[PDB]
Design a binder for this molecule. Sequence first.
Ligand code: ZN
Ligand code: ZN
Lengths: 153, 226
Amino acid sequence: ATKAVCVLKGDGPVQGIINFEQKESNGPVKVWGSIKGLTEGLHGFRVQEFGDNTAGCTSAGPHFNPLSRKHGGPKDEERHVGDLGNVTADKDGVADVSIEDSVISLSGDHCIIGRTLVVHEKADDLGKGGNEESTKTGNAGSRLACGVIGIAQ
Amino acid sequence: EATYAICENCVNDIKACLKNVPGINSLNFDIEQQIMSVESSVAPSTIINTLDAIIRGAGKPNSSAVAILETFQKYTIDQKKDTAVRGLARIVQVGENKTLFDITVNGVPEAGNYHASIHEKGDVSKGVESTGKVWHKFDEPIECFNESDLGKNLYSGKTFLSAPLPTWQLIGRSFVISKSLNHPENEPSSVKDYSFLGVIARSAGVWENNKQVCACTGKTVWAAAK
Ligand SMILES: [Zn+2]
Ligand SMILES: [Zn+2]
């Protein structure tokens, strides 16, 4: 499994497409695409445990976390597998996403295919918040858009 | 072996209802979670119709999936504009290489047999076009001739499907349901088929009784027919 794709959509203007590419099974995952309809600023961006979107937050589960860690920023030693930090929307409400991540994968225990990718209204506090919820979800507020990560090749 | 979802007086009410049915090897019960496990060679549609019971996921990891099936194109004949959801597939692994599909369809404009398939890729950016080749064709049709509770000129259907595939092999692919348009002419898009689809998603398989789909809000935007 070498390429994956996700169509982010929601009830509002936020919508986007995100691509994933991983040449080696234990190489990094390249993550790129665009999200539009965002307010200017930083938005929480992560993968949930499940891709079941029948019941919203409830069915998609917590952050994808097979190693049972606490929440963190993507560069942090302590983080969920699903934690991809923040995307940044410019003044025209467009977030151009360009990420390399070493923790997510397109195969094995960290495989994100078939899970929900989500973009949130507020910034992820990257677990650096002074409350317990910070160490669980990063306090990114409500979900603006989501999609299931599917096989692209 | 499959798991079904349903006080202490409730318990024997159900075990009763099932007893004269053959092919059943054992019955186990967990009234706490309100579920029931049944190990058998007997059809699940038999188990459920006899009883209200839904197919549910076991606790087994990566054994359950779901696909929310939405239209991608705008159809002339399709004037339901509050949601593009037309169908729901609940998928449970019931064997080592055996899987069961709880399919519901509701709110389609044309009565008919709809055909289910799994396509190779879970890329729904371009609707069916981007999902690539058929990967598994389901021979059995979804019979949609029942009128839909969503109003007149709308139809519904339901069926269980089966495949010799483990759940993990379906994750990330596309589940696609389609029917030839009766009137391809009236459709400007040069589109010949009425299709709705979704990426097959990992699921905990802890589904509630009513087969429904909510918006990112939480509001219910679609449900299986009564
Ligand atoms: Zn997290
Ligand atoms: Zn009772």
